[PDB]
Design an enzyme around this catalytic site. Structure first.
Site, PDB file in Angstrom:
ATOM      1  N   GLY A  11       0.754  -1.115  -0.048  1.00 30.02           N
ATOM      2  CA  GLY A  11       0.158   0.031   0.049  1.00 30.02           C
ATOM      3  C   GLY A  11       0.905   0.976  -0.117  1.00 30.02           C
ATOM      4  N   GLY A  13       0.460   6.017   0.256  1.00 27.00           N
ATOM      5  CA  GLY A  13      -0.599   7.135   0.334  1.00 27.00           C
ATOM      6  C   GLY A  13       0.082   8.369   0.259  1.00 27.00           C
ATOM      7  N   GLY A  14       1.392   8.250  -0.369  1.00 20.61           N
ATOM      8  CA  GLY A  14       2.022   9.710  -0.496  1.00 20.61           C
ATOM      9  C   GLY A  14       2.964  10.346   0.694  1.00 20.61           C
ATOM     10  CD  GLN A  17       6.826   3.566   1.180  1.00 15.68           C
ATOM     11  OE1 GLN A  17       7.699   3.553   1.955  1.00 15.68           O
ATOM     12  NE2 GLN A  17       7.126   3.021  -0.221  1.00 15.68           N
ATOM     13  CB  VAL A  18       0.759  -0.546   4.474  1.00 18.60           C
ATOM     14  CG1 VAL A  18       0.495  -1.588   5.724  1.00 18.60           C
ATOM     15  CG2 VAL A  18      -0.064   0.629   4.698  1.00 18.60           C
ATOM     16  CE  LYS A  29      -1.029   4.401   8.227  1.00 18.64           C
ATOM     17  NZ  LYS A  29      -2.286   4.622   9.019  1.00 18.64           N
ATOM     18  CG  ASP A 122      -9.764   5.570   4.442  1.00 14.57           C
ATOM     19  OD1 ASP A 122     -10.808   6.074   3.534  1.00 14.57           O
ATOM     20  OD2 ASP A 122      -8.856   5.108   4.081  1.00 14.57           O
TER      21      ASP A 122
HETATM   22  O1  LIG Z   1      -3.759  -6.476   7.404  1.00 11.33           O
HETATM   23  C1  LIG Z   1      -3.787  -6.267   5.979  1.00 11.33           C
HETATM   24  N1  LIG Z   1      -3.951  -7.303   5.250  1.00 11.33           N
HETATM   25  C2  LIG Z   1      -4.186  -7.241   3.868  1.00 11.33           C
HETATM   26  C3  LIG Z   1      -4.401  -8.136   2.967  1.00 11.33           C
HETATM   27  C4  LIG Z   1      -4.417  -8.105   1.617  1.00 11.33           C
HETATM   28  C5  LIG Z   1      -4.115  -6.835   0.956  1.00 11.33           C
HETATM   29 CL1  LIG Z   1      -3.913  -6.831  -0.559  1.00 11.33          CL
HETATM   30  C6  LIG Z   1      -3.940  -5.640   1.792  1.00 11.33           C
HETATM   31  C7  LIG Z   1      -3.721  -5.934   3.332  1.00 11.33           C
HETATM   32  C8  LIG Z   1      -3.582  -4.585   4.314  1.00 11.33           C
HETATM   33  N2  LIG Z   1      -3.371  -3.413   3.453  1.00 11.33           N
HETATM   34  C9  LIG Z   1      -4.597  -2.632   2.972  1.00 11.33           C
HETATM   35  C10 LIG Z   1      -4.537  -2.721   1.373  1.00 11.33           C
HETATM   36  N3  LIG Z   1      -4.933  -1.370   0.922  1.00 11.33           N
HETATM   37  C11 LIG Z   1      -3.775  -0.426   1.141  1.00 11.33           C
HETATM   38  C12 LIG Z   1      -3.337  -0.599   2.728  1.00 11.33           C
HETATM   39  C13 LIG Z   1      -4.195  -1.305   3.268  1.00 11.33           C
HETATM   40  C14 LIG Z   1      -5.496  -0.558   3.220  1.00 11.33           C
HETATM   41  C15 LIG Z   1      -6.104  -0.652   1.818  1.00 11.33           C
HETATM   42  C16 LIG Z   1      -3.431  -4.856   5.475  1.00 11.33           C
HETATM   43  C17 LIG Z   1      -3.165  -3.917   6.492  1.00 11.33           C
HETATM   44  N4  LIG Z   1      -3.251  -4.194   7.768  1.00 11.33           N
HETATM   45  C18 LIG Z   1      -2.707  -2.839   8.413  1.00 11.33           C
HETATM   46  C19 LIG Z   1      -2.538  -2.552   9.589  1.00 11.33           C
HETATM   47  C20 LIG Z   1      -2.288  -1.256  10.072  1.00 11.33           C
HETATM   48  C21 LIG Z   1      -2.079  -0.349   9.043  1.00 11.33           C
HETATM   49  C22 LIG Z   1      -2.079  -0.698   7.459  1.00 11.33           C
HETATM   50  C23 LIG Z   1      -2.553  -2.081   7.249  1.00 11.33           C
HETATM   51  N5  LIG Z   1      -2.854  -2.545   6.224  1.00 11.33           N
END
Ligand SMILES: O=c1[nH]c2ccc(Cl)cc2c(N[C@@H]2CN3CCC2CC3)c1-c1nc2ccccc2[nH]1
Length: 273
Positions: A11, A13-14, A17-18, A29, A122
């Protein structure tokens, strides 16, 4: 990266990044170094603490919070396998009834965060993932907004049109639990009729029943197959109460919306019963 090791990017966000990582698979993150001043950084650490206190099956645990050697704030959280809720329900061809049961479960997670003083800000399908665990569809709510109002304003913005509330879209100061309620409403609209909510001139979408009634026959067939129903039964079940519930949640004025996710859940349970 500490006890943690980056595997791949997932992921951007500018301003952050995740990544997929691991010691346990985690999300990591990163926040841009110039995004948070001393006050934003204080606010970020505090809200990260609040998140860390939540114990709910549908919310990722928080393993760590810090600042890296490039000056970036970071958090490590549980990584949840799953697919966006709307896409998942279509793929597994859930009935309206099974969809509403999952709506209750998603609503109970968001209600738990509200009770601990946390607002997501969000909510959208990609932040609400579903997998099957012990035979049941179980949701995971991820990527809570942290310190969103304290960001460097020197940095198509904010959330997603359709899910984000009018107040958020107008850049409003007073964004509260009712904004999450609006976003749940928009998600539940899509789960129910398979069509996006489009705010008309008065800032309100058509009722789901009327939305699916207007679309051509091919779109109609696909929507009804993905909900294991006939068009006529879908139209009636929506008219029976899901229209009113999703429209209350999508009231353009916060004052006309459900005051709490608890009030929304009560109406969902009355529809099921
Ligand atoms: O736990 C996750 N599982 C995923 C499983 C599949 C995919 Cl494609 C993305 C995430 C995923 N990213 C999303 C995919 N897409 C961009 C980033 C996030 C939101 C939508 C997260 C995640 N867990 C987080 C915990 C804290 C902060 C960020 C986080 N992102």
């Amino acid at each position: 990266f500490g006890a943690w090791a980056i595997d791949r990017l997932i992921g951007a966000g500018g301003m952050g990044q995740v990544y997929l990582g691991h010691r346990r698979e985690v999300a990591i993150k990163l926040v841009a170094a110039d995004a948070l001043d001393a006050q934003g950084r204080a606010l970020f650490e505090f809200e990260c603490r609040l998140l860390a206190q939540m114990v709910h099956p549908a919310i990722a645990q928080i393993h760590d919070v810090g600042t890296d050697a490039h000056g970036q704030p970071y958090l490590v959280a549980e990584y949840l396998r799953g697919e966006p809720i709307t896409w998942w329900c279509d793929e597994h061809r859930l009935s309206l009834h099974a969809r509403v049961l999952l709506m209750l479960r998603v609503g109970e997670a968001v209600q738990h965060a509200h009770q601990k003083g946390v607002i997501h800000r969000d909510l959208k399908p990609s932040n609400v993932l579903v997998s099957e665990i012990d035979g049941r569809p179980m949701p995971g709510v991820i990527d809570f907004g942290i310190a969103v109002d304290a960001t460097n304003p020197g940095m198509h913005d904010r959330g997603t049109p359709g899910y984000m509330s009018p107040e958020q879209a107008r850049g409003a100061q007073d964004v509260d639990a009712r904004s999450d309620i609006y976003a749940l409403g928009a998600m539940f609209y899509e789960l129910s009729c398979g069509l996006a909510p489009v705010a008309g001139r008065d800032g309100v979408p058509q009722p789901p029943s009327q939305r699916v009634a207007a679309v051509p026959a091919d779109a109609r067939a696909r929507i009804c197959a993905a909900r294991a129903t006939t068009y006529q039964k879908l139209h009636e079940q929506l008219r029976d109460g899901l229209d009113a519930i999703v429209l209350r949640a999508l009231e353009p004025q916060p004052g006309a919306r459900y005051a709490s996710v608890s009030a929304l859940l009560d109406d969902l349970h009355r529809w099921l019963d």
